[PDB]
Structure 1
Amino acid sequence: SGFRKMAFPSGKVEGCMVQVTCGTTTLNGLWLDDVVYCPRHVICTSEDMLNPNYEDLLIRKSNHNFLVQAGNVQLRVIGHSMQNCVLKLKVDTANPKTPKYKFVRIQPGQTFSVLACYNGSPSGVYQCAMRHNFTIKGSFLNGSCGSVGFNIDYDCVSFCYMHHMELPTGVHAGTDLEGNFYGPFVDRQTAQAAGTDTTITVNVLAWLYAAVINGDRWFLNRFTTTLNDFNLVAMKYNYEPLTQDHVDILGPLSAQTGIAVLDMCASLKELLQNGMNGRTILGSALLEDEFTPFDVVRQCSGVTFQ
């Protein structure tokens, strides 16, 4: 028993992390087979970032201008190209620690683990979610760019996020591993405001199921509701509208606990309208929304990897 915000084991990704330096800028890259992936703004100076022309800035770079270091060993760069907002540096040595892997572009509400790195060396690992405004709430200091987010399925690492930017409001933006930003953000130091950070309703409901499985039951109430009536309350509290697709995804947790999805919606409705009254759920004093249904099923059943 117990329920914790739990990241994936990070060893498979630690073995892919390298340092990339261009000019005087140093950040992190991801070394998979004979390619190193990194943010293209490694080629920029601090001044360049206010209005960069990446195609023109890249004319002044050759293979030997990219210093790539795995631990204390230099990799030899034999080719480079820009793909959207990432650089692909071809190196002459396949990473011997390359795991089975996929590149995935995730949907808002989906969670992943971040391995925070500086200078090519791992710092820590934590769990995140893609918000509906296409930011993440990370922990990223200077030099963390190129740190990646990932999910693991048994033996296969699905890479879904590369870190690029901190917005002036302190939240974070980045790309998938094909170099396309999540949401409207750009790799330019400019006025970029995030939209509404709506609460991921289906994740809150999954977490309430996790609470019930663990014996936290005080919030279960006598009511049920409908999708349309619940959603009238969801909109008022800036929750994502619940769909029948979401109901279906909660099916297995509904079956395990015997609590119908709409009954749990009515308990959530009461929690939104009355608050928690100084009580806690699974040790939390707010409604947690960065556990997906699949996250809950995993932690409550003991799925392993390696």
Structure 2
Amino acid sequence: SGFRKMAFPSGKVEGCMVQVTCGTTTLNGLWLDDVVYCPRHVICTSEDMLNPNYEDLLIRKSNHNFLVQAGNVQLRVIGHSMQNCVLKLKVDTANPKTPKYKFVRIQPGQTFSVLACYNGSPSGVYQCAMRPNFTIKGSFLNGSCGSVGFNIDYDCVSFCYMHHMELPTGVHAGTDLEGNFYGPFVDRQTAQAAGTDTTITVNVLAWLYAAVINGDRWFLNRFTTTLNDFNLVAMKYNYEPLTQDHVDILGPLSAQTGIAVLDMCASLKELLQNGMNGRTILGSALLEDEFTPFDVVRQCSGVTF
């Protein structure tokens, strides 16, 4: 037993991380087959980070202007192209360590593992969620751009995130691997702010199921609620409305534990209205919302990759 904020094993992604240097700027790229993907702002200049004409800046560059490395193995770039806010740099060497992969664009509320890197060297791994406002709360320093976020399924790595920027508040914004930002942000240092951060209700309920599974039962009660009455209380605390789809995906956890979804909603209603009264749930004093129902089943059933 035990329940922890758990990342995917990173070995398959580690073997795809490289370092990309354009002039002074250095960041991380993802090496898959004969292509390296990285954030396009690697071409920017010191005094042109407000209104960069990325098209015009790139056509003026050349293949050699991009210095790429597999740690201690330099890569020759033999072609470059822009796709939205990412660059595709063709190289003469296919990555022998390329995994089975696909590019996916995740939905708010879903989770992924971030492999934080610097100078193409993996530094740490942690689990993040896509917030309802299309930001993530990560840990990213200068040089971390190009770090990727991913999931694993069987043997296939689904890449969903590339890191590009930090907004004031310490929240992080990036693109999918097609180069399109999550949310309305742009890769310019013009003033931008995130929208309302709401709590992912379906995930809080999943984590309450995880707690029961791992022996914390004190918040269970003998009340029930209707979904209608639960949602009127959720709204007041800036929780996502709980939909029938959410009830559906909580089904398996409800069946494993013997606690109906709306009975767990009644527990959450009480926790919202009255707090924890100095107790804790799975070592936390707050209601945690960065575990999905699948994350709970995955960890509690011990599935491997």
Q: TM-score, normalised by structure 2?
A: 0.99
CA-based RMSD: 0.6
Deviation at 1:226, TM superposition (A): 1.2
After superposition, give the CA deviation of every residue in 1:243-293 in whole Å (9 maximum; x if it has no partner). Answer: 000000000000000100000001000000001111100001100000000
Once the two structures are TM-superposed, the CA of residue 46 in structure 1 deviates from its matched residue by: 2.9
Distance apart, 1:228 and its partner CA: 1.2
Q: Which runs of 5+ in 2 are unaligned?
A: none
Q: Percent identity?
A: 100
Say which is worse superposed, 52-61 or 208-217, in terms of deviation: 52-61
Alignment correspondent of 2:290: 290
2:88 matched to which residue of 1?
88
How far the C-alpha of 1:168 sits from its partner, in A, is 2.1
**Residue-by-residue CA offset, 1:112-156 (whole Å, 9 max, x unaligned):** 000000000011000000000000000000000000000001211
**C-alpha distance in 2 between matches for 1:80 and 1:198:** 40
Local SS of the residue matching 2:290: coil
Equivalent pairs, count: 305
Partners of 1:138 and 1:77 lie apart in 2 by 31
2:42 counterpart SS class: helix
Q: CA deviation at 1:50?
A: 1.4
- Displacement of 1:45: 1.8
Counterparts of 1:124 and 1:58, CA distance in 2: 31
TM score, norm. by length of structure 1 = 0.99
Q: For each residue in 1:150-202, what CA deviation from the matched residue of structure 2 results, as whole angstroms up to 9, or x when unmatched?
A: 00012110000000011122100000000000010100001111111100000
Shift of 1:52: 1.0
Task: Kindly state the Cα deviation for residue 49 of structure 1 after the two structures are TM-superposed.
Answer: 1.2
**Partners in 2 of 1:213 and 1:206 — Cα distance?**
11
Shift of 1:57: 1.2
Deviation per CA, 1:26-61: give whole Å up to 9, x if none: 000000011100000000023221111111111321
CA distance in 1: counterparts of 2:46 and 2:147, whole angstroms: 19
2:89 alignment partner, SS class? strand
User: Matches of 2:46 and 2:200 in 1, distance apart?
Assistant: 36
Q: What residue in structure 2 maps to residue 220 of structure 1?
A: 220
Equivalent-residue separation in structure 2 for 1:45 and 1:4 (angstroms)? 42
- Which deviates the most, 46-55 or 265-274? 46-55
- DSSP-derived class of the 1:223 partner: coil
CA-to-aligned-CA distance 1:221-256 (integer Å, 9 cap, x gap): 121111111111111100000000000000000000
